[PDB]
Amino acid sequence: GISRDSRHKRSATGAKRAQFRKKRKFELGRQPANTKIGAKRIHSVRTRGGNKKYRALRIETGNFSWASEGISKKTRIAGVVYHPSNNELVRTNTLTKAAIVQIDATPFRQWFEAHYGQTRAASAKIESSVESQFSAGRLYACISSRPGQSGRCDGYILEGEELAFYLRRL
Amino acid sequence: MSELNALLKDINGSLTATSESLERLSGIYSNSPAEKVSLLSLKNGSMLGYINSLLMLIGNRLDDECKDPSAMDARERSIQHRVVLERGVKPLEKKLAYQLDKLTRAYVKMEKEYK
Amino acid sequence: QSVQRDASKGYSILQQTKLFDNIIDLRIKLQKAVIAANKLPLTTESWEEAKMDDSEETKRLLKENEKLFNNLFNRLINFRIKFQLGDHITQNEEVAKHKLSKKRSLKELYQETNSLDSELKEYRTAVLNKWSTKVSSASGNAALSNLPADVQVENQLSDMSRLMKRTKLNRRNITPLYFQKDCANGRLPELITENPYVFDDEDFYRVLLNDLIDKKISNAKASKGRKLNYSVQDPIANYEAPITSGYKWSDDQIDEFFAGLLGIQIF
Amino acid sequence: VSVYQVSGTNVSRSLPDWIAKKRKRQLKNDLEYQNRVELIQDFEFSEASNKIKVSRDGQYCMATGTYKPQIHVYDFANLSLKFDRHTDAENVDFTILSDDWTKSVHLQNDRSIQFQNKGGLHYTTRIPKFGRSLVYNKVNCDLYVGASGNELYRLNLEKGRFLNPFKLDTEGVNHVSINEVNGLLAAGTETNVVEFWDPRSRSRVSKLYLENNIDNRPFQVTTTSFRNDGLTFACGTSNGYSYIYDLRTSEPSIIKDQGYGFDIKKIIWLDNVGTENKIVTCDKRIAKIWDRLDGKAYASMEPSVDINDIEHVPGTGMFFTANESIPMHTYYIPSLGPSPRWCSFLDSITEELEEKPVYSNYRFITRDDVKKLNLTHLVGSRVLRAYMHGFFINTELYDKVSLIA
């Protein structure tokens, strides 16, 4: 039933276009895959051609990157904190690209201690807000993946201007 | 440090804060026609007295002379005050309990209505 | 109008009840003193030896000790007098005010304690009689005519010997300082585990804690439908039919029950 | 009390169901697979289930899925999936208007109310703000939709018109419920208050401020349910506290807390089963059965997998749970009542059922909460019995210690 055809839309002048032809498979549409937190249910999709798409209905772990330190770890997802498009997705804890979420800080903290030998000093200096988040034990992260396409919830830690932006939005 | 001195410090620390409760408690009562349940006021004065017998118990012990290490005068008063609480008051208020609960709830309901 | 009296007494009861939790807090805080006091020496030589262990140290604490009790207990005897005045326990208002004004000594402070106790004793006899008569009448025990409360107090007070032995029980196993030295030297006539000199009110102290514990528990923009459109949506028109029977209760009972939702001598 | 799992995954909680699917071809030789009996054929969603509801006729049931979003309909008389229908978006809520499965309304997460007739999807309408619950008024035939915003949406099926919306003092409606005998509606606001509104008029009869002495944490009203008697009213909070109110009086008659500190997903009154003074409270992990009057726990329901919904078959000891697992679990408790008519010989095989049996009786307290309550010294004592990460304590002692802290 979902279609992407522009024909059903009326013209730029506002003229109501008549139905040229029946809906076609090649201009089909599919639903949103409303990914949520929990023990990782996924499935595949057969798309146009021999290609396939992975649909993450639920996922509790994701590969998140500390860009400032240039590292990446797999960590458990805490919960959705802010989504710019719709707050209901935040209430429903729906996982989607650009969604602001909370993640465990255990692996990042352990790596920081390992590499820097600190809980040399100048390099160990990082932002104050991220240090506060470490003290809390949870980190604000932004999902850079599209779970409803690739089946992955990859993302990155918020920092600097973006972190301040999403903190003040919070 | 000597055992007596550490003990004496504990008594000193014990007393100084029993005071601030005492001024605080005396302040609120002095802040308070309303007639009180005369049974309870006895159940007050008795257990005031019990605490006082405990204080004369403490005081008699503390005297470096200790003519009365057993502090028998403090003992008997503590007995009398505890006696009245446990068997005189306690059964009577149990027979009395339910309507006291009915009166206090009535006042609370009235105050909630007023606010 | 009787509601006002009923409300006022409830306030008095409430004020009356809070007063205990404040005093029971006083007893709770004093609990560390009685335990530590029971650990103190017993005989003059032990006190001197306790003093000789650290002479200069033992002095100011003893002065800092002695000064506070005179301040604690003197304020307390003032504290006691005003109640028995205010609660009508003492009938001589002028004498009570005179006692409050004057500053009293330790020996005199003991005398007031004896008088305050003695005056309270007559109050016990008068009080315990009245309610026992009332409860007896209220329960039909008057119709029947289970001892009077005052009689029970008198009888068990007559069983005076038994109750020290309960007090003298050393449940906590407190050993006062230099107890062994006093025992060896024969300086403790009463002894010559139950200790006559160690006082244990732990069973009672716990009960008030439990009672205070038990009390509080019981007390405790147009697009996408984003604006509202009231027009007819024909597909849903007449999707169902209303049930004319209505709600099971009558409307009068209904409109009633919502009102109460969540709140010649005639009388 | 004896509780039986008629159907569902019987593997360890940590073990996922799809791994068992790989194991199924391995264990085809094992006898227990042959001996295992299913109640309804295809009583599973490809991935998971959200909500489950039974027709008032009692010969049909309705459920919805995650992928593809289905609306399964199972015929109890036929013990099979009557049909399968895909939906454009994931369903949030639905109610069955008709006696049979023919006429239903489903509230989707795309803020669209979609109406299904026996033939198919009839019409889709779009509400201004996203909905949190849906309830139908049989007397007036007006669909009321709770919403994220303060205003509560009113749609009148009879006139095909959307009528004026109720305006609420606070934002967020979560759950809405209607008393069939009074008609009073309770809206479970996000804040710790429930608003009571007159159906006949457009008026707030009153608003009740829920109060919890034990926890000072803010809590939200998750669920609301009226009793058929119509005088008692139940509330579910986000903190796992269930409140039953005699609606005439402000004070709560009984306060019951679930144990795990999680949202109460559903409350069901077990009047029809017999021994009417019984109530079911459902959290994500456990659905407990207890007496409204005594508060005593009668039976407890502990699936390995989280619960999304609970439904009871009227007049029987049968319960249906909409859950995260591929197979939705099915429970039979003989003591409450007889098995359904269609489940004639379920009784015959009660020995063959699993008969699953502390956690319901005791109070689960995480390690961090133990620190908050300064109960670290009791770790290792009989008072605190450690299961999983939480130290189980008596409910009375928990209310005790909380008052000190």
Place this chain on the structure above:
Amino acid sequence: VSENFLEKMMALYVSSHYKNSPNDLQLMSDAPAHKLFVLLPPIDPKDGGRIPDPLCVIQIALEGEISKESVRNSLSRGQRAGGDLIPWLISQQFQDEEFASLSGARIVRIATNPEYASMGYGSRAIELLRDYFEGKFTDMSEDYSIKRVSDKELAKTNLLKDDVKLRDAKTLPPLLLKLSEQPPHYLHYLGVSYGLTQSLHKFWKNNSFVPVYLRQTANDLTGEHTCVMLNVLEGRESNWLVEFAKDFRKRFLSLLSYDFHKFTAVQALSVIESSKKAQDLSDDEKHDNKELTRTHLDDIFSPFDLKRLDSYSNNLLDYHVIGDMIPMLALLYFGDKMGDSVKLSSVQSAILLAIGLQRKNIDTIAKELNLPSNQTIAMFAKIMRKMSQYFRQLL
């Protein structure tokens, strides 16, 4: 004011009753034992002393305290003295002389407003009753007799000049009295007499009354059997009720088949349960059920009979073949000789009671419980299995 207030109670009293007679009015005013008692809503101070409407009105009669000598003389003569219904009936049925001496009160009638029925007002009134006679309403604020016309006044008045006037309002006490004001009489029990209906039986069971007697003759006007239910007060001895309850239970169980076979199994089960609640009232263990002995088991059932029961549990036997054991099994189970080992559901007990004691056919049970015959058979075969296991472990 009394007239208006007076009318209002009978408006409540007559409404509950079917066909009231004016004679009861003379009973209520003149007879000494009857006391007039009313539940009222909260009095709003702003209403200026206007009398609220009666929500519930209860009629009690003080009965008992019968001289022990009088009991034998009347019992030997078979003559029933007027009044004191409950002492006489219980004494006649149980031949107990001590009960008549006991002081009690019969709740003659209870009346609740039909529009407000089922809201719990009746339960509240009784729950407050049982507190009053228990003495829980004591006076907390630190006379009600009226002077009678003197013989001097009567002698001084001539018939012609008689000024017959209403009694002066000052002399009169208040129309309504608070409980704390008026002391109660010392009572041992509260008793009732009513036709055994499920709603009423459910009502009184929730009120902690226990059964003592049921008339075997149904009342012709109603077709209903009157049930006598009794509740003892705290602080009073409780034993004699417990013995009465056990006897009634044995009496009831056996008599189910004669004339109460019409009763629904659910209704019969409730009566048994209500009696068993009386045992739970007695924390004392001096009077307790006796577990069935092996010797008694052998006397009751022969070995072949035990083999017969086992085969049915194993399903190697037909239902009709085991029809023999049923009444004995029902008696022993409901006699509680089976003990802690054997327990059953409410439906399960009803089925066993019906075939065993109401003696109905299994199909008759099927229609009554709205269960198809197969489940009743299957659920029943489960019943027989558990006892067969119970007999096995005893052996």
